[model samples]
Target chain A: MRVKVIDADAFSYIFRTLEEFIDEITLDFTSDGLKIRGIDPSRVTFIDILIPAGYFEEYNVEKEEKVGVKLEDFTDVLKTVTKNDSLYLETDENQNIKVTLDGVYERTFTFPSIVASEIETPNLNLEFPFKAKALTVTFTDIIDEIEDIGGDSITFKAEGGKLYLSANSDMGSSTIELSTENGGLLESEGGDAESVYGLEYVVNTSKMRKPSDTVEIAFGSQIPLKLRYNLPQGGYADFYIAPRAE
Target chain B: MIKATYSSAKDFYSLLSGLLKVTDEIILNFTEDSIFSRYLTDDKVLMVIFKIPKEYLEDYTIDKPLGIKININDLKKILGKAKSKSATVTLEETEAGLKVTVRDEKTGTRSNIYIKGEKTSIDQLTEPKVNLSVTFTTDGDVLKDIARDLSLVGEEVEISADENTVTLSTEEAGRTYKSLLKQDKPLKSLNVESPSKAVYSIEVLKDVFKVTSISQNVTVGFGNNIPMKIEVPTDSGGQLIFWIAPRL
Candidate 1:
């Protein structure tokens, strides 16, 4: 399998996003496109990324096949490529993916080959009720503030014109309230919605946004929180994290 | 209302020296007693404001009473190395001794200083007030850059802050530095407001904002040039403010 992409930034984002989860990833090369699949050990959450062959400036492959790759090694090679450079990925008969960036620069990395299989997750089509728009800094600030109190879980209560974040620990407890009139980013709409989430997961998820960017959060009772960060040009980086009960 | 007095004037100086760069006169008013502290500045950069509750002094009586005063550089120098081991602060008749403790983590060396004095009465000579808004949420690295440029040119820098725009103008060097972050990036674009306008001493500005440069942004505010308010955001709920008397 072989394909070439003009921009490196796209690959950079994918590598960074997935590197935090799985150490190894499976890459399936088809006449249509490239597919990446990995499972997070802790939550068993699966990440599937599909990059259409049409998305690549150049695509050339005699046949379609699957290749398992060591994510750590592949990501390290991708890191060396500058944003503006071109990236060419090809697999050898022995199953090693040879990554040649910028035509002249080349690096061949190997991985343990595994029979590629497909995994399906439960469909989440239910509409969410609550949404929050916030400056990335403010969201991070709120998480950092709550983290100081120390707890495995935190509850987010959105009702009336106020948003309340509360956490409890053996040592002490913390409750922070942000009111719509008190300069909060966004208030609740319609009736109201509340959710309890794992502090451990939310804190790790918050790192995806740069301090200066903004993110939109949507969630409801027993529903997964959807975090979306709008890219500079278009499209977005989205993550769905399930809720944690008390 | 609370009134307290401490024996070590240097303890007050050192505390202010380490904590604040912008001076805002804080008036502590207690029933039958009051204490006032004005932040003193030199070269319009370094500032120290200290207020001792009235409880530390012996034979002290504050009834409908108030104390006010501005600390000077000489007092800071004396306090910087004063050998006094203990200082007491008194409120009404209640008193607490403050043991000034400073430890050098690397050297594992510690120093202790004290303040001692009789009951004294003080009042503020001038009262200046202004409301300042900060645009940057981080620390003061850019402020250090502006201060460095100004020190080479003149003794004063004109600063303007409104809405999201914060600009610094130096006339003698015919230069201005302005920074604004409307987009969400760690380091936002800083525009040099005007190429040529005012003169300033970068030396003083550097020393003042240097400590604050650890953060991502810094903001300054002033009116009629008497006292300037500078604020830096800390990691927790606390904030550091400095009230400096501008040289201009």
Candidate 2:
């Protein structure tokens, strides 16, 4: 299996963000594209990332392959890339991973791949009564506000044509209210749904806001939060965070 | 009362964001002429001194000198919310706490964030006096790239510079990685009383790269087994300096 990413920076951003929550992940390469699925150490969060074959400048998979790697190490190598660099991923005869960067300078890094235990991708066919779309920046800002309150969890309340993110602590309470009619909220439905989630997971996942222009949020009462966003280079990312008991 | 206005919200965000990478908290000293800050890493192996003079602010006022402790990470997140570089940022003292207002002229949207200051035992750190035998100036990007490459092979990296060239190298087990740059190429200026070599933790050097995110060039001074000094120039007549202890 060999894949080339013409936009190294964008590809790096995606992988780096994933590294924040997970140290290792398995990448399944099929004829379609690359499929990555992993759960955080605590099992509170699950991430599913897909990069369509169309997004890659050059992609070829002689046979379907599943490779597990230490994403933190992979991201360290990716950080050395410049905007002008082109990144290539290929497997050697021994099945070790080989990453090559071509630009003003050429460099190659090799690491052995590991056999990963099977990870079952959860079925997300259930309906989420509340769905809303908002600019990535706005959503990220709201999350930051709740984080400042120094609470372990944050609650999301959508009702009366507005989204409210609130956190309460012995120190104080803080809330951010965004009206649905404004640019902050592009669309919404199911006027009422409230759920609480661990703030650390949400803040780490917000790293996706960098490469994504807008984010789609879906959740139901006491259901996991599902966030979807399109990558700048192409494809999209789907993230799920289990709700916390209030 | 203390009030200050920064023409660009993005620039202020970048400054605080960069500092947060080195230290979690900092002491902000608001004086008659400038707002200065100094920070020491948790390990006490590194120190950073930052200053922005009153001349850089669009508006600056301070009735009396006041010292406050700020959690840099929180400030960075608040500033990160600004819509764009054109946004206006104003800082003022309020009865409740410190009020930071960011206004996007283009969209006519505003965000108000309040941060309460905390009393800290930290005091302004005095700068250390040092005489170094080796001093050089190089592009910040060059240093960042060298550090990144060297960090891949080992935890500790060795840097040596003579009159004509500079070399960075690291070894792990039996494998070795090395990169060399001639003084004539990337080094703008190189001076050495005698050839010098220093070893530092690669992780710490990587933190120094955060300064490069804002400055193009960095002036470095060090000697064998001595603390390394890095000076990064800011756009507003400000200066960011870092001191990293050498590994024995």
- Which one wins on lDDT? 2
Residue-level lDDT of model 1, residues B1-248, one tens digit each, is: 23344454333444445444444333322323223354445453555433333343334454555432222332343345333334232333222212233322222122332222123354443444643333334347656655566666655666554444545655555654444333243335333322212222345455666655644554454544445655653332123455565565
lDDT of 2 by residue, B1-248 (tens): 88988776776766665563555656777777777788777787788777677887767877777776766776777777888767878878666557788889888788877877763343555766777778888777777776677668767878888877666666664334555565656677788888899998878887786456577667888888888889876554556778888998
User: What is the overall TM-score of model 2 with all chains considered together?
Assistant: 0.55
The complex in candidate 2 yields a DockQ of 0.06
Model 1 accuracy (lDDT, Cα): 0.53
> On residues A194-228, what C-alpha lDDT tens digit does candidate 1 reach at each position?
88777765655455444226666667888876666
TM-score of chain A of 2: 0.91
Q: State which candidate has the highest DockQ.
A: 2
lDDT per residue for candidate 2 within A32-96, as digits (tens), equals: 78988888888888888888888889999978888888787778888888888899988876776
TM-score for all models, in order of appearance: 0.41, 0.55
lDDT of 2 at A223: 79
What is candidate 1's CA lDDT for residue B135? Answer: 31
